[PDB]
RNA sequence: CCUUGUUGCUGUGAAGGCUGGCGAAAGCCAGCUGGAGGCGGCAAGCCGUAUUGAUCUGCAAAUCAUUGGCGUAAGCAGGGUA
RNA sequence: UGAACUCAUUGUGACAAGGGGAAUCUGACUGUUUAGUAAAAACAUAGCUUCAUGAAGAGAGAUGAAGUGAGUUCUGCCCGGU
RNA sequence: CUAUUUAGACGUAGACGGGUACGGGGGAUUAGGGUUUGAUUCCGGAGAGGGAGCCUGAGAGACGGCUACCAGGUCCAAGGACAGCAGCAGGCGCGAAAAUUACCGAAGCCUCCAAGAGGGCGGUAGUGAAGAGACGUGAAAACAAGUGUGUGUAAAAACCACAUGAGUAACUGGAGGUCAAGGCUGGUGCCAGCAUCCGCGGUAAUACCAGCUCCAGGAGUGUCUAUGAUGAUUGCUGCGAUUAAAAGGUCCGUAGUCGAAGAACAGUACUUGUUUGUAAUGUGGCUUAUCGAGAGCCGAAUAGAACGAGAAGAGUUCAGAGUAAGGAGCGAAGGAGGGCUAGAUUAUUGAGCAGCGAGAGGUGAAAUUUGAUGACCUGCUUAGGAGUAACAGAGGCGAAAGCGCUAGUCAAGAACGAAUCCGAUGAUCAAGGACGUAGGCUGGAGGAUCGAAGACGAUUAGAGACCGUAGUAGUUCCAGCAGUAAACGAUGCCUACGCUGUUGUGGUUAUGAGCACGGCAGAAGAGAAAUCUAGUAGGGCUUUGGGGAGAGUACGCGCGCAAGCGAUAAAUUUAAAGGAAAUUGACGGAAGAACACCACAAGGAGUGGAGUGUGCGGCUUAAUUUGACUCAACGCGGGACAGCUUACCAUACCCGAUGGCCGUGUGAGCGUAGUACGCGAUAGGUCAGAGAGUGGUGCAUGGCCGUUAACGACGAGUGGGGUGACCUUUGGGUUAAGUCCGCGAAGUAGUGAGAUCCCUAGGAUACGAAAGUUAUCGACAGGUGUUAAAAACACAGGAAGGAAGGGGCAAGAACAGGUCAGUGAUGCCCUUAGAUGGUAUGGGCUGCACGCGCACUACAGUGGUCACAGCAGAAACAAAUAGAAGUAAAUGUGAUCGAGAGGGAAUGAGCACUGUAAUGUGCACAGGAACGAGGAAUUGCUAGUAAUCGUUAUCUCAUUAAGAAGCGAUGAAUGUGUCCCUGUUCUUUGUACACACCGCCCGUCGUUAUCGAAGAUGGAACCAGGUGCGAACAAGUGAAAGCGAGUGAGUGCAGGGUUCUAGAUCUGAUACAAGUCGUAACAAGGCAGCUGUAGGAGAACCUGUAGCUGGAUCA
C-alpha cells in the first residue's frame, strides 16, 4: 500500500518566525547565589508556601 | 529313467572348541584352533564377447589367430532304455 | 628374520603376470537361449497371492491349474459391460 | 641421541584433541562475602617482513652483522649493485578512534686509549576540554586577565617581586509522572514531530514548533558504547520446585560426596608463637612548597616458606560393650502379592430339531436393514472363545505399572512377640544393568463379544462428524522387540522434633494399653491467597527452574525391524504472558426456592373468515411529504386532510442588521389606466459580517415521556473478621411490601413501602322556611372459633369487615429506548431571490395488482313490521301540510310478517342543506353484492365486574364520528388453587468476557516483507601432519680433482581439520489495519474438556483404546 515523504518539515516552514529581545548580562558564581538566597527567603521557613513561576 | 567315468594349485576364513583379560551379574574384548560356501584368482576342460581381424575358386556346405566368460558344481560325458 | 660388502643404465630382469576412481538407466544373485548374422533389459529362480477337490498304488505340511518375480516399504477407488 | 633387552607411562578428581591467551607486582567497583580487568613507569619472557643456517667473541643462533629461498621494493651506462622505522621526528593507508620532519657543553645515568670526546637513553618546551587540584566573572566606597624591569634557565618561556595602565569577563540540558522547576501567549490540527519507560497530537496540546519567565549543575554540561553496582534476577554467607518456570515412571548399582555409644592412643593437616617474605601502589602518620592536590622522611603489613607449641574437633585401635543402625535366624498367625496343575454357576453369539403364523429392530422422532427359504418368542440338544455381577467399602496386598470363582502345589518377602547370633557390615547415587497400563511391531496358536479404517441410512447451507445399520485390523494366548502417559496425592529418599478428639486393618496384652499401616475433624503456627505431604531447622545425598515467543525445534551423535525415542542450540522478535489466587459486575443453551386471570388450569365474550370504516408495507404517479418496528411500531404522532392544516407537485407573484469601499436632489429609488404625469433619498452595486428554515444528525444534548416496576430493595455511624481489594454472616415461619416474628459478633437511627389527599357510599344536635344542603363521626381482624410468635380464614352483626371499594402520588441504579415534525429549549453540518423563506389559484396527501394490524354492521324468529305507552345520568330545544340535526335506547302491551319479508354493498333521474368553492352531509324513489357463525393461531376479564343498550350542554367540529374520554340503563358465569406453560424477582453455580456474548478466539488458503534449514554442482582462506624433489652451509676422506653424513628453507602431488560464501528449487518461523472459508476452545460453548498411542481428513480437527479432574459429583 502507499506511502509518500512529501510532507517532510511541514511545521518548521508555517512557525512565524520571532526576534529574541534583549536583556542584561546575567551574575555567575556567588553573585548568582546571594540573588537567588534572597529571593527564596519564604521557603527557608518550615511554614506557609513558596511557589517559583506563577501565571496568575 | 537305469548302470558308470571325471576335482590338481592357491586366496578369503562361517558354525563349533581352548587359553588370557574385564564385569555384581547378564555377556563383552584379544590371540590361537577348525574348515562352511550353486564364494574369489588360475590349470585340464567346457563355452562363444570383441577385433564388425584372417579366409570367402577356403584347410572347412561354419574353420583359424589373438582377446574374452565359467571352471568344489540348478558342471561335463560313454553305453542301455523310453 | 636382521646386518654388512658389491655392480655402467639395476634386480616378480627372459617366461608368466589386475588399469583405477565418480555417477545415472536396468535386471536381485549363480544359471539358460535363436547348432550357421541377436547372449540381452528376454527365460528361469527363491519368495508372495489366488483357484479346484476327501478322489487314489498318492490322501490336504496332499495333488493338480494360473499370475507376479529375492529381501525392505506400500499395494487407493469401481461389479455399470464381458 | 644411538645399539640390544623389559612393557611400561597417562586418564571421568577430565587424559588426548580443538578454541583462547605475554605472566605477575597491581587497577576499577565495593558495609561484609564478592564481580570484573591488567598492551601500559618495576620484574621476568619472546620478536625484529616470513622461515631456516652461521662466523667472531668471555657472552649472539645478533638483524642500525653475514648467507640462501619466499613475498615485496630501489638504482643503472643493462653488465651489475643496494636495502628492512614493533628507535626519534615524519608520510600513506585502515578505521568510531591518538601530538613537533622542535632546543639540549644543564639535571639522572651508560661508553671509551680520556683533567676530554660521544648518546633522539634521558631531560626542556610546543600540541589536545581523555584524568586530578586551587581560583576570576564585582564590592558598597573602590574589582582577574595587560605592560615594563629584575628573577628564573643550558638558553629560555611560564612562575614569583616591584612599578605602571585600566574596568573587560557563561554556557549546556530541562520545566505531564518517575524527577527539581509554567495548565502563560501565538502557530499546527493522529499532520509535522516528541518520547530510555509510561504516553502526547483527530482546531479548547502545562508533553510538537517558537517567544517569555522559572529550575539544575556550572568552565563546563548533553549523547553513544563496553563494564561494576541496582540484584537475595546465580543465592558460600543468601533464592526457589502442590497450583506461578521447576522432584527423574519404579528399583538395583560403581566412581563421587557423607557416616553410632564407651575406653584409650598418636601428631601430618587444624590453630598459634618466633623468624623470614613487599620497590612503586595502597595503609597509619609527621614535615616543607601562599593554600590544596604534589614532594620528602617514618611505622606496620598479604599470600608463600623455616623451626617450635597445644590437643577440643577430625583421625587410628581395642573388646568382661552390645542403637527406637543393619543383616542372619526362631515361634504363632494374616493378605484380590506372584508362577503352575486340575475343575465350576450363569451369560452373549452360531448351528440342529419342535411348536405358533405376522411382524421384529432402533430412536428425541424416523429411515437404512431383516421376515412366509417361517422371523420374533417358548422348548430341548449341542460348538466355541472371553469374563468372574450382586457381597464390595474414603477395605486389603504389591517397588511402581498393577491384583477379585474353587481346590492342590512351588519359591521368596513385610509386620508382630521374645533374656537367639554376628559386629559397622551403613545413607544417597553420574556411568552401567532389570521391570514398565494401553496402543504399536516380528513370528506361531486361535477368533464368541466389541470395534479404528472403509461403506451406507438420516440431520443440515454443507456434514466429511455427532445418531442408526453393518464391517475389517486389532481386542485373547505363547516367544520376543519397543520405552511413552494428567505413569498425579501435579508434593524425591533416608533421619529428627512436634496438640487433641474420633474411626478402621493385623498381631500382642498387667485388659490399663502399645507396635506397624491408614482415614477423618478441629487447633496452633505457616503462606500472596486458595489451603496445609506446606509447622520447627546451616542434618546428609541426588534430580531440577531463572520474562514471553521461536523450541523440546535445527545440526551432529547413541539406541530401535519400523513407528520413533533419548539428549539438546542459534539467528530473529516482543512489554508483558487466555502467568497465579482471591474481589465486584456482565453473560450462560444451569441448578433451587417464590409469585401473578395485563400467567396458566376450570369458567364467560370475542379476534383470525364476509362487506364496509380506518392505519401499515408494496407498486404507480407531476406529487402520491413523513416518524415509529418483540412486549414497549400499525383509529399512534391529540394524524375525523374540499380551502387552511401541509412538510409534497404545476403555474404565478412577493422579500435583505451593521461596517468598509464605489454613486447620488443636475434626482439614489417609488406610484400609475406606465412612459407622462404624481412622490421624493426612504429604500443604491461590491467585499466582510449578521440576524429565517415542518432542511440533516436523539450515536452531540436538555427537558418530558415510556420500560425494568409498581419491584423490595437501599444508603449512614459505631462494633467484629481479612494483608488487602471485601463480608457482617447458618438463608426457619408471615405480607401486597426486609411487611414482619424468631435467632445471632453485632447494635442504633432514616429514605422507599407504609403512613400521609381527593372523589363515591352512611350520619344533624348545625342552617333554611323551604322540603334540600353540608358534616373532627363511623371499621379496629374488634367479636366468636381455630392450643409458640407474627398473620389468616370462615361466620355474625353492621350504611360500610380483613390494604372498606376506585383512583392519585410514588426509591436507587439503568437504557448509546422515543421525540431536533411541540417549543424564541439546543451543539455541529447544509440551503438562503432562478430560496430548502412566505403568499395565491389549482392538483395531491383520499391513486390501486396485492400482503398485514385494529374497529363497525351482520349472518335472523331469545327475530322484522304497525301503533301505543313509559323510565336515566337530570333539568336549555324559532317556526315547519311528503321529507329534508336534537331531551334516550334497549324496554312494556297489542296487532301484524313467516324461514334469505334477515342484509343493505356497487349504481340511476332527481329534491334540499353547509360552504368562497362540493368533491362532504341530509331526504325521497328505485336497485338489490358477499355473508347461512369463521383454518393455523390469538386477546382481555373475579361483581354492580364481563357482555348488551343508548346518550353526550365532553374532545375534535362551517359542514363532517363507525375515534378517543366520560356517563348512566339492563345485568352474568367459574376457581378460591398451582409453578406444568409464559414470563418476572432472589439465593447457591461456571468463566480465557470488563470495551462486558453484537464479547473473546483457532487453523488452512491468497498477497507482501524479514531471518533460518535442506539441496545436484562449488569457491575461498588458514592450520598441522604424509610422501617426492631439493638452495645454502658443511664434519669426515683425499697431494689434488673430487666425494659427501648431517642441519634444512622453499616447492611438487594426494588427503584431512577448521571457519566463511555461491546455488535452480523446496520447506520452517515471525510481522502482516480489518482479504477468503468455516467456527475448534472459553457457559453442560450447544458431542464436558485435557494427556499418551494408532488410523483418517480442505482446514480448524474427527474416530477407536487405556488414563486424569485442572468437572457439571467431597453425598
Known sequence: ?????????????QTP???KS?????LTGRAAWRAKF???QELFTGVGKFKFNKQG
Open 1 to 13: 500500500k502507499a506511502i509518500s515523504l512529501n510532507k517532510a518539515g511541514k511545521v518548521r516552514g
Open 17 to 19: 518566525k520571532v526576534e
Open 22 to 26: 534583549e536583556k542584561e548580562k546575567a
Open 38 to 40: 534572597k529571593r527564596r
